Amino acid sequence: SKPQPIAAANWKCNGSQQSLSELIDLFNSTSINHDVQCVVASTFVHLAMTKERLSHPKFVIAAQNAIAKSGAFTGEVSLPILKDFGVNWIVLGHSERRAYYGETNEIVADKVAAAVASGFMVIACIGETLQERESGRTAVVVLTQIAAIAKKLKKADWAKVVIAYEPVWAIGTGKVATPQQAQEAHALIRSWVSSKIGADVRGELRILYGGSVNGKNARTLYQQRDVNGFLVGGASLKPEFVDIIKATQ
Amino acid sequence: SKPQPIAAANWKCNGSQQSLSELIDLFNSTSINHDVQCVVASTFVHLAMTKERLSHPKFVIAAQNAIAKSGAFTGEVSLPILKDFGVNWIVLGHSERRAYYGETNEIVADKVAAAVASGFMVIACIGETLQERESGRTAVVVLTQIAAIAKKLKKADWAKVVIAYEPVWAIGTGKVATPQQAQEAHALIRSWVSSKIGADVRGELRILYGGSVNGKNARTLYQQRDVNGFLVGGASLKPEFVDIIKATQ
């Protein structure tokens, strides 16, 4: 089984022209032998340099966020502007946005709905916090966030949705997630889809692992039955991201 | 009296490549005979096109927002990245950000503090809502927001600060601000500075009018003793912004 993997680089709020251009040069020089989709999410500022400079055909570029429509939202970027600029991929509802920037399950679901409508391929992020994990509410929690999103789509739309699982309870808390844990959460998501949506959609759905991934652990994680790739944080600003790509064969 | 005026275009969350490039062509062709500083605040996405394409030496480009430092803030842009990209001007604490995006007087003051430190010229926005205006709390309100900002600076820093007054109570409420009202609020700000900070700083401080400005009302507003220019919303995406510039002679 297993659909086409995705290796997504999330740069977050990092980067300089010099540093980003060297990393891009690196990517452009990298031989990618299997069928993987590679995704580079840069700051809005860096989207133009990235777009001009990144030439390897296995890479696409993405935005890390947007609001649904244009207008009187000083400092924001809307979906129309991105589309006009030629960006078709977007990350939405990342935990850092849910924690710091006010995004609720319904705001994230609305964004997802809008992007999909405008024809974006969407990487949609879910996951439970330490408190949730501790009280045994992983299933509930994850399932509630996925259902919020699913309430606003139609079966054909799932075609342009990728799910990232974020083990937020393992992110800066001192807890460590293991590949078996990663696989349980992914299998739990996968089943829910097959049931509510359809085994068809379910078998073709990509579920990315959005916890701590590096060149050392990447391969083992990938070896998990329900892991279709990664949404990579810090290792994605380093030459080791190449290794993470290679781990998807 | 009167220092050098500023005519700032705030594009907010608008723009397309085609539309923005035609407007830029327009600006590049415009004869500006007096000493004015013109500022164009585009979405982060459009900063690179703007930077390449805008050539008139009386224009600078600005960002509409940022956070103080780089890191794990998916979807945000920090001050370091902007500076690296060559952007030295920034708008901070716009009412739309205060209303929708959670920005308090202290968050805005912290951003202002950070920008200034990194050497930005800062357009800092203040103003009272309809409720505040109605209960006669204009002075209090405005003075409280300006003091929050002032708590974090030093006298030399004021050198790189521009104050925009936003009559938020006149923004989409059905209320209309008149040039006398604009002038009262500006004079009230100006006095406070002369007192707390120094008549020196006060005489050289630019206070922009951030309400509804167009080619028709621009000139009358400018004619006010304490109005040093405008932070223009919707008319700034139109050919009439040229007229608003001309009104500053």
Side-chain angles (χ1 to χ4, degrees), chain A residues 10-17 43-49 64-65 67 69-78 81-82 84-85 94 96-97 100-101, chain B residues 10-17 43-49 64-65 67 69-78 81-82 84-85 94 96-97 100-101:
Chain A
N10 173 12
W11 288 345
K12 314 174 169 193
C13 180
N14 302 284
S16 81
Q17 304 172 72
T43 78
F44 298 133
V45 175
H46 297 128
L47 293 157
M49 159 192 5
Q64 294 170 14
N65 180 41
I67 54 174
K69 63 179 50 193
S70 302
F73 303 108
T74 296
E76 307 286 319
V77 178
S78 68
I81 293 186
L82 290 172
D84 182 80
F85 206 62
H94 187 267
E96 282 148 21
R97 292 209 80 77
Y100 320 136
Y101 294 119
Chain B
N10 173 12
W11 288 345
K12 314 174 169 193
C13 180
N14 302 284
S16 81
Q17 304 172 72
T43 78
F44 298 133
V45 175
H46 297 128
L47 293 157
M49 159 192 5
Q64 294 170 14
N65 180 41
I67 54 174
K69 63 179 50 193
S70 302
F73 303 108
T74 296
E76 307 286 319
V77 178
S78 68
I81 293 186
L82 290 172
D84 182 80
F85 206 62
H94 187 267
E96 282 148 21
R97 292 209 80 77
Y100 320 136
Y101 294 119

Coordinates of all heavy atoms in Angstrom, one line a residue, chain A residues 10-17 43-49 64-65 67 69-78 81-82 84-85 94 96-97 100-101, chain B residues 10-17 43-49 64-65 67 69-78 81-82 84-85 94 96-97 100-101:
Chain A
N10 N 9.0 22.7 7.1 CA 8.4 23.9 7.6 C 9.4 24.8 8.1 O 9.9 24.5 9.2 CB 7.3 23.6 8.6 CG 6.7 24.8 9.3 OD1 6.9 25.9 8.9 ND2 6.0 24.5 10.5
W11 N 9.7 25.9 7.5 CA 10.8 26.8 8.0 C 10.4 27.7 9.1 O 11.3 28.3 9.7 CB 11.3 27.7 6.8 CG 12.2 26.8 5.9 CD1 12.7 25.6 6.2 CD2 12.7 27.1 4.6 NE1 13.5 25.1 5.2 CE2 13.5 26.0 4.2 CE3 12.4 28.1 3.7 CZ2 14.1 26.0 2.9 CZ3 13.0 28.0 2.4 CH2 13.9 27.0 2.0
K12 N 9.1 27.8 9.4 CA 8.6 28.7 10.5 C 9.2 30.1 10.3 O 9.5 30.5 9.2 CB 8.8 28.2 11.9 CG 8.3 26.8 12.1 CD 8.6 26.2 13.4 CE 7.9 24.8 13.5 NZ 7.8 24.4 14.9
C13 N 9.2 30.8 11.4 CA 9.7 32.2 11.3 C 11.2 32.3 11.3 O 11.8 33.0 12.2 CB 8.9 33.0 12.3 SG 9.3 34.8 12.2
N14 N 11.9 31.7 10.3 CA 13.3 31.7 10.1 C 13.8 32.0 8.7 O 13.1 31.7 7.8 CB 14.1 30.4 10.6 CG 13.8 30.0 12.0 OD1 14.4 30.7 13.0 ND2 12.9 29.1 12.2
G15 N 15.1 32.4 8.6 CA 15.7 32.5 7.4 C 16.3 33.8 7.0 O 15.8 34.9 7.5
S16 N 17.3 33.8 6.2 CA 18.0 35.0 5.7 C 18.3 34.8 4.3 O 18.0 33.7 3.8 CB 19.2 35.4 6.5 OG 20.3 34.6 5.9
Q17 N 18.6 35.8 3.5 CA 18.7 35.5 2.1 C 19.8 34.5 1.8 O 19.6 33.5 1.0 CB 18.7 36.8 1.2 CG 17.5 37.8 1.4 CD 17.8 39.1 0.7 OE1 17.7 39.1 -0.6 NE2 18.1 40.1 1.4
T43 N 8.7 31.7 4.9 CA 7.9 32.9 5.4 C 7.3 33.6 4.1 O 7.7 33.2 3.0 CB 8.7 34.0 6.1 OG1 9.5 34.7 5.2 CG2 9.6 33.4 7.2
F44 N 6.3 34.4 4.3 CA 5.7 35.0 3.1 C 6.8 35.8 2.4 O 6.8 36.1 1.2 CB 4.6 36.0 3.5 CG 3.4 35.4 4.2 CD1 3.0 36.0 5.4 CD2 2.7 34.4 3.6 CE1 1.9 35.4 6.0 CE2 1.6 33.8 4.2 CZ 1.1 34.4 5.4
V45 N 7.7 36.4 3.2 CA 8.7 37.3 2.6 C 9.6 36.6 1.6 O 10.0 37.2 0.6 CB 9.5 37.9 3.7 CG1 10.7 38.8 3.2 CG2 8.6 38.8 4.5
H46 N 9.9 35.3 1.9 CA 10.9 34.5 1.1 C 10.3 33.7 0.0 O 11.0 33.0 -0.7 CB 11.7 33.5 2.0 CG 12.6 34.3 3.0 ND1 12.5 34.0 4.4 CD2 13.4 35.3 2.9 CE1 13.3 34.9 5.0 NE2 13.9 35.7 4.2
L47 N 8.9 33.9 -0.2 CA 8.3 33.1 -1.2 C 8.8 33.5 -2.6 O 8.8 32.7 -3.5 CB 6.7 33.3 -1.2 CG 6.0 32.6 0.0 CD1 4.6 33.3 0.2 CD2 5.8 31.2 -0.2
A48 N 9.1 34.8 -2.8 CA 9.5 35.1 -4.2 C 10.9 34.6 -4.5 O 11.0 34.0 -5.5 CB 9.4 36.6 -4.5
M49 N 11.9 34.7 -3.6 CA 13.2 34.1 -3.8 C 13.2 32.6 -3.9 O 13.7 32.0 -4.8 CB 14.1 34.5 -2.6 CG 15.3 33.6 -2.4 SD 16.2 33.9 -0.8 CE 14.9 35.0 -0.2
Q64 N 2.8 29.2 5.1 CA 2.6 28.6 6.4 C 1.2 29.0 7.0 O 0.9 28.6 8.2 CB 3.7 29.1 7.4 CG 5.1 28.6 7.0 CD 6.2 29.3 7.7 OE1 6.0 29.9 8.7 NE2 7.5 29.3 7.1
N65 N 0.5 29.8 6.4 CA -0.7 30.3 6.9 C -1.4 31.3 5.9 O -0.6 31.8 5.0 CB -0.6 31.2 8.2 CG -1.9 31.7 8.8 OD1 -2.9 31.0 8.7 ND2 -1.9 33.0 9.2
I67 N -5.5 33.9 5.5 CA -6.9 34.1 5.9 C -7.6 33.9 4.6 O -7.0 34.0 3.5 CB -7.2 35.4 6.5 CG1 -6.8 36.5 5.6 CG2 -6.4 35.5 7.8 CD1 -7.2 37.9 6.1
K69 N -10.1 35.6 2.9 CA -10.3 36.6 1.8 C -9.6 37.9 2.0 O -9.2 38.3 3.1 CB -11.7 36.6 1.3 CG -12.7 37.0 2.3 CD -14.1 37.1 1.7 CE -14.5 35.8 0.9 NZ -15.7 36.0 0.1
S70 N -9.5 38.6 0.9 CA -8.8 39.9 1.0 C -9.6 41.0 1.6 O -10.9 41.0 1.5 CB -8.4 40.2 -0.4 OG -7.6 39.2 -1.0
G71 N -8.9 42.0 2.1 CA -9.5 43.1 2.7 C -8.7 43.9 3.7 O -7.5 44.0 3.6
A72 N -9.6 44.5 4.6 CA -9.1 45.3 5.7 C -8.6 44.5 6.9 O -9.2 44.5 8.0 CB -10.1 46.4 6.0
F73 N -7.5 43.8 6.6 CA -6.8 42.9 7.6 C -5.4 43.3 7.6 O -4.6 42.5 7.1 CB -7.0 41.5 7.2 CG -8.5 41.1 7.1 CD1 -9.1 41.0 5.8 CD2 -9.3 41.1 8.2 CE1 -10.5 40.7 5.7 CE2 -10.6 40.8 8.2 CZ -11.2 40.6 6.9
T74 N -5.0 44.5 8.0 CA -3.6 44.9 8.0 C -2.7 43.8 8.7 O -2.9 43.3 9.8 CB -3.6 46.2 8.8 OG1 -4.3 47.2 8.1 CG2 -2.1 46.7 8.9
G75 N -1.6 43.6 7.9 CA -0.6 42.6 8.3 C -0.9 41.2 7.8 O 0.0 40.4 7.8
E76 N -2.1 40.9 7.5 CA -2.4 39.5 7.0 C -2.2 39.2 5.5 O -2.3 40.1 4.7 CB -3.8 39.0 7.4 CG -4.1 39.2 8.9 CD -3.3 38.1 9.7 OE1 -3.2 36.9 9.3 OE2 -2.7 38.6 10.7
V77 N -2.2 37.9 5.1 CA -2.2 37.5 3.7 C -3.4 36.6 3.4 O -3.5 35.7 4.1 CB -0.8 36.9 3.3 CG1 -0.8 36.4 1.9 CG2 0.3 37.8 3.6
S78 N -4.1 36.9 2.3 CA -5.3 36.1 2.0 C -5.0 35.0 0.9 O -4.0 35.1 0.2 CB -6.4 36.9 1.4 OG -6.0 37.4 0.2
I81 N -4.6 36.4 -2.9 CA -3.2 36.9 -3.1 C -2.2 35.7 -3.3 O -1.4 35.8 -4.2 CB -2.8 37.8 -1.9 CG1 -3.7 39.0 -1.9 CG2 -1.3 37.9 -1.9 CD1 -3.3 40.0 -0.9
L82 N -2.3 34.7 -2.5 CA -1.4 33.6 -2.7 C -1.6 32.9 -4.0 O -0.6 32.7 -4.7 CB -1.5 32.5 -1.5 CG -1.0 33.1 -0.2 CD1 -1.4 32.1 0.9 CD2 0.5 33.3 -0.3
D84 N -2.9 34.1 -6.7 CA -2.4 35.0 -7.7 C -0.8 34.9 -7.9 O -0.2 35.1 -8.9 CB -2.8 36.5 -7.4 CG -2.3 37.4 -8.5 OD1 -2.9 37.6 -9.6 OD2 -1.3 38.2 -8.2
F85 N -0.2 34.8 -6.7 CA 1.2 34.7 -6.7 C 1.8 33.4 -7.2 O 3.0 33.3 -7.4 CB 1.7 34.9 -5.3 CG 3.1 35.4 -5.3 CD1 3.3 36.7 -5.8 CD2 4.1 34.7 -4.8 CE1 4.5 37.3 -5.7 CE2 5.4 35.3 -4.7 CZ 5.6 36.5 -5.2
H94 N -1.5 25.0 12.3 CA -0.3 24.4 13.0 C -0.5 24.7 14.5 O -1.0 25.8 14.9 CB 0.9 25.1 12.4 CG 2.2 24.5 12.9 ND1 2.8 25.0 14.0 CD2 2.9 23.4 12.6 CE1 3.9 24.3 14.3 NE2 4.0 23.3 13.4
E96 N 1.3 25.9 16.8 CA 1.8 27.2 17.2 C 0.8 28.3 17.0 O 0.8 29.3 17.7 CB 3.1 27.6 16.5 CG 4.3 26.9 17.1 CD 5.4 26.6 16.0 OE1 5.6 27.3 15.0 OE2 6.2 25.7 16.4
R97 N 0.0 28.1 15.9 CA -1.1 29.0 15.6 C -2.3 28.8 16.5 O -3.0 29.8 16.9 CB -1.4 29.0 14.1 CG -0.3 29.6 13.3 CD -0.8 30.2 12.0 NE -1.4 31.6 12.2 CZ -0.8 32.7 12.4 NH1 0.6 32.8 12.5 NH2 -1.5 33.8 12.7
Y100 N -0.8 30.1 20.1 CA -0.6 31.5 20.3 C -1.5 32.4 19.6 O -1.5 33.6 19.9 CB 0.8 31.9 19.8 CG 2.1 31.1 20.1 CD1 3.0 30.8 19.0 CD2 2.3 30.6 21.3 CE1 4.2 30.1 19.3 CE2 3.5 29.8 21.6 CZ 4.4 29.6 20.6 OH 5.5 28.9 20.8
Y101 N -2.0 32.0 18.4 CA -2.7 33.0 17.6 C -4.2 32.9 17.5 O -4.9 33.2 16.5 CB -2.1 33.0 16.2 CG -0.6 33.4 16.2 CD1 0.4 32.5 15.9 CD2 -0.3 34.6 16.9 CE1 1.7 32.9 16.1 CE2 1.1 35.0 17.1 CZ 2.1 34.1 16.7 OH 3.4 34.4 16.8
Chain B
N10 N -1.3 52.5 3.0 CA -1.4 51.2 3.6 C -2.3 50.3 2.7 O -3.5 50.5 2.7 CB -2.0 51.3 5.0 CG -2.3 50.0 5.7 OD1 -1.9 48.9 5.2 ND2 -3.1 50.0 6.8
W11 N -1.7 49.3 2.0 CA -2.5 48.5 1.2 C -3.3 47.4 1.8 O -4.2 46.8 1.2 CB -1.5 47.8 0.1 CG -1.1 48.9 -0.9 CD1 -1.7 50.1 -1.1 CD2 -0.1 48.8 -1.9 NE1 -1.1 50.7 -2.2 CE2 -0.1 50.0 -2.6 CE3 1.0 47.9 -2.1 CZ2 0.8 50.3 -3.7 CZ3 1.9 48.2 -3.1 CH2 1.8 49.3 -3.9
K12 N -3.1 47.2 3.1 CA -3.8 46.1 3.9 C -3.7 44.8 3.1 O -2.7 44.6 2.4 CB -5.2 46.4 4.3 CG -5.3 47.8 5.0 CD -6.7 48.2 5.3 CE -6.6 49.5 6.2 NZ -7.9 49.7 6.8
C13 N -4.7 44.0 3.4 CA -4.6 42.7 2.8 C -5.2 42.7 1.3 O -6.2 41.9 1.1 CB -5.1 41.6 3.7 SG -5.1 40.0 3.1
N14 N -4.6 43.5 0.4 CA -5.0 43.6 -1.0 C -3.9 43.5 -2.0 O -2.8 43.9 -1.7 CB -5.8 44.9 -1.3 CG -7.1 45.1 -0.5 OD1 -8.1 44.4 -0.7 ND2 -7.0 45.9 0.6
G15 N -4.3 43.2 -3.2 CA -3.3 43.4 -4.3 C -3.2 42.2 -5.1 O -3.3 41.0 -4.7
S16 N -2.8 42.4 -6.4 CA -2.5 41.3 -7.3 C -1.3 41.7 -8.1 O -0.8 42.9 -7.9 CB -3.7 41.0 -8.2 OG -3.6 41.9 -9.3
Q17 N -0.7 40.8 -8.8 CA 0.6 41.3 -9.4 C 0.4 42.5 -10.4 O 1.0 43.5 -10.4 CB 1.5 40.2 -9.9 CG 1.9 39.1 -8.9 CD 2.6 37.9 -9.6 OE1 3.7 38.1 -10.0 NE2 1.9 36.8 -9.8
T43 N 1.6 43.9 1.4 CA 1.5 42.6 2.1 C 3.0 42.0 2.0 O 3.8 42.5 1.3 CB 0.6 41.5 1.4 OG1 1.3 40.9 0.3 CG2 -0.7 42.0 1.1
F44 N 3.3 41.1 3.0 CA 4.6 40.6 2.9 C 4.9 40.0 1.5 O 6.1 39.9 1.1 CB 4.8 39.4 3.9 CG 4.6 39.8 5.4 CD1 3.7 39.1 6.2 CD2 5.4 40.8 6.0 CE1 3.5 39.5 7.5 CE2 5.2 41.2 7.3 CZ 4.3 40.5 8.1
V45 N 3.9 39.4 0.9 CA 4.2 38.7 -0.3 C 4.7 39.6 -1.4 O 5.5 39.1 -2.2 CB 2.9 38.0 -0.7 CG1 3.0 37.3 -2.1 CG2 2.6 36.9 0.3
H46 N 4.2 40.8 -1.4 CA 4.4 41.8 -2.5 C 5.6 42.6 -2.2 O 5.9 43.5 -3.0 CB 3.2 42.7 -2.8 CG 2.0 41.9 -3.3 ND1 0.8 42.0 -2.7 CD2 1.9 41.0 -4.2 CE1 0.0 41.1 -3.3 NE2 0.6 40.5 -4.2
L47 N 6.3 42.4 -1.1 CA 7.5 43.2 -0.8 C 8.6 43.1 -1.8 O 9.3 44.0 -2.1 CB 8.1 43.0 0.6 CG 7.2 43.4 1.8 CD1 7.6 42.6 3.0 CD2 7.4 44.8 2.1
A48 N 8.8 41.9 -2.4 CA 9.9 41.8 -3.3 C 9.6 42.4 -4.6 O 10.4 43.2 -5.1 CB 10.3 40.4 -3.5
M49 N 8.4 42.3 -5.2 CA 8.0 43.0 -6.4 C 8.0 44.5 -6.3 O 8.5 45.3 -7.0 CB 6.6 42.6 -6.9 CG 5.9 43.5 -7.8 SD 4.1 43.1 -8.0 CE 4.1 41.8 -6.8
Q64 N 3.5 45.8 7.1 CA 2.3 46.3 7.9 C 2.3 45.7 9.3 O 1.3 45.8 10.1 CB 1.0 45.7 7.2 CG 0.8 46.4 5.8 CD -0.3 45.7 4.9 OE1 -1.0 44.9 5.5 NE2 -0.2 45.9 3.6
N65 N 3.3 44.8 9.6 CA 3.3 44.2 10.9 C 4.6 43.3 10.9 O 5.1 43.0 9.9 CB 2.1 43.2 11.1 CG 2.2 42.5 12.5 OD1 2.5 43.1 13.5 ND2 1.9 41.2 12.4
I67 N 6.7 40.4 14.3 CA 6.9 40.1 15.7 C 8.4 40.4 15.9 O 9.1 40.5 14.9 CB 6.6 38.7 16.1 CG1 7.3 37.7 15.2 CG2 5.1 38.5 15.8 CD1 7.2 36.2 15.6
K69 N 11.1 38.7 17.2 CA 12.2 37.9 16.9 C 11.9 36.5 16.2 O 10.8 36.0 16.2 CB 13.3 37.8 18.0 CG 12.7 37.2 19.3 CD 13.8 37.1 20.3 CE 14.6 38.3 20.5 NZ 15.8 38.1 21.3
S70 N 12.9 36.0 15.6 CA 12.7 34.8 14.8 C 12.5 33.5 15.7 O 13.1 33.4 16.7 CB 13.8 34.7 13.9 OG 13.9 35.8 13.1
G71 N 11.9 32.6 15.0 CA 11.7 31.3 15.7 C 10.5 30.5 15.3 O 10.1 30.5 14.1
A72 N 10.1 29.8 16.3 CA 9.0 28.8 16.1 C 7.6 29.5 16.3 O 6.8 29.3 17.2 CB 9.1 27.6 17.0
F73 N 7.3 30.3 15.2 CA 6.1 31.1 15.1 C 5.6 30.9 13.7 O 5.6 31.8 12.9 CB 6.4 32.6 15.3 CG 7.1 32.8 16.7 CD1 8.4 33.1 16.8 CD2 6.3 32.7 17.8 CE1 9.1 33.2 18.0 CE2 6.9 32.8 19.1 CZ 8.3 33.1 19.2
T74 N 5.1 29.7 13.4 CA 4.6 29.4 12.1 C 3.6 30.4 11.6 O 2.6 30.8 12.3 CB 4.0 28.0 12.2 OG1 5.0 27.0 12.5 CG2 3.4 27.6 10.8
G75 N 3.8 30.9 10.4 CA 3.0 31.9 9.7 C 3.4 33.3 9.9 O 3.1 34.2 9.2
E76 N 4.2 33.6 11.0 CA 4.7 35.0 11.3 C 5.9 35.4 10.5 O 6.8 34.6 10.2 CB 4.8 35.2 12.8 CG 3.5 34.9 13.5 CD 2.4 35.9 13.3 OE1 2.6 37.1 13.2 OE2 1.3 35.3 13.1
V77 N 6.2 36.8 10.6 CA 7.4 37.3 10.1 C 8.1 38.2 11.2 O 7.4 39.0 11.7 CB 7.2 38.2 8.8 CG1 8.5 38.8 8.2 CG2 6.5 37.3 7.7
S78 N 9.4 38.0 11.4 CA 10.0 38.7 12.5 C 10.8 39.9 12.0 O 11.1 40.1 10.7 CB 11.1 37.9 13.2 OG 12.1 37.6 12.2
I81 N 14.3 39.1 9.9 CA 14.0 38.8 8.6 C 13.7 40.0 7.7 O 14.2 40.1 6.6 CB 12.9 37.8 8.5 CG1 13.3 36.5 9.2 CG2 12.3 37.7 7.1 CD1 12.3 35.4 9.0
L82 N 12.9 40.9 8.2 CA 12.6 42.2 7.5 C 13.8 43.0 7.2 O 14.1 43.3 6.1 CB 11.5 43.0 8.1 CG 10.1 42.4 8.1 CD1 9.2 43.2 9.0 CD2 9.7 42.3 6.7
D84 N 16.9 42.0 7.2 CA 17.8 41.3 6.3 C 17.3 41.5 4.8 O 18.0 41.6 3.8 CB 17.8 39.8 6.6 CG 18.7 39.0 5.6 OD1 19.9 39.0 5.8 OD2 18.0 38.3 4.7
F85 N 16.0 41.6 4.7 CA 15.4 41.7 3.4 C 15.5 43.2 2.9 O 15.2 43.4 1.7 CB 13.9 41.5 3.4 CG 13.4 41.0 2.1 CD1 13.9 39.8 1.6 CD2 12.5 41.8 1.4 CE1 13.4 39.3 0.4 CE2 12.0 41.3 0.2 CZ 12.5 40.1 -0.3
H94 N -1.9 48.7 14.3 CA -3.0 49.3 13.6 C -4.3 48.8 14.3 O -4.3 47.6 14.7 CB -2.9 48.8 12.1 CG -3.9 49.4 11.2 ND1 -5.1 48.8 11.0 CD2 -3.9 50.6 10.6 CE1 -5.8 49.6 10.1 NE2 -5.2 50.7 9.9
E96 N -6.9 47.4 13.3 CA -7.4 46.2 12.9 C -6.7 45.0 13.5 O -7.3 44.0 13.7 CB -7.2 45.9 11.4 CG -8.3 46.7 10.5 CD -7.8 47.2 9.2 OE1 -6.9 46.7 8.6 OE2 -8.5 48.2 8.7
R97 N -5.5 45.3 13.9 CA -4.6 44.3 14.6 C -5.0 44.3 16.1 O -5.1 43.2 16.8 CB -3.2 44.5 14.4 CG -2.8 44.1 13.0 CD -1.4 43.6 12.9 NE -1.2 42.2 13.4 CZ -1.6 41.1 12.7 NH1 -2.1 41.2 11.5 NH2 -1.4 39.9 13.3
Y100 N -8.9 42.7 15.9 CA -9.0 41.3 15.6 C -7.9 40.4 16.1 O -8.1 39.2 16.1 CB -9.0 41.0 14.1 CG -9.8 42.0 13.2 CD1 -9.2 42.4 12.0 CD2 -11.1 42.3 13.5 CE1 -10.0 43.2 11.1 CE2 -11.9 43.1 12.6 CZ -11.3 43.5 11.4 OH -12.0 44.3 10.6
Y101 N -6.6 40.9 16.2 CA -5.5 40.0 16.4 C -4.9 39.9 17.7 O -3.7 39.7 18.0 CB -4.5 40.2 15.3 CG -5.0 39.9 13.9 CD1 -5.2 40.9 12.9 CD2 -5.7 38.7 13.7 CE1 -5.9 40.7 11.8 CE2 -6.4 38.4 12.5 CZ -6.5 39.5 11.5 OH -7.1 39.2 10.3

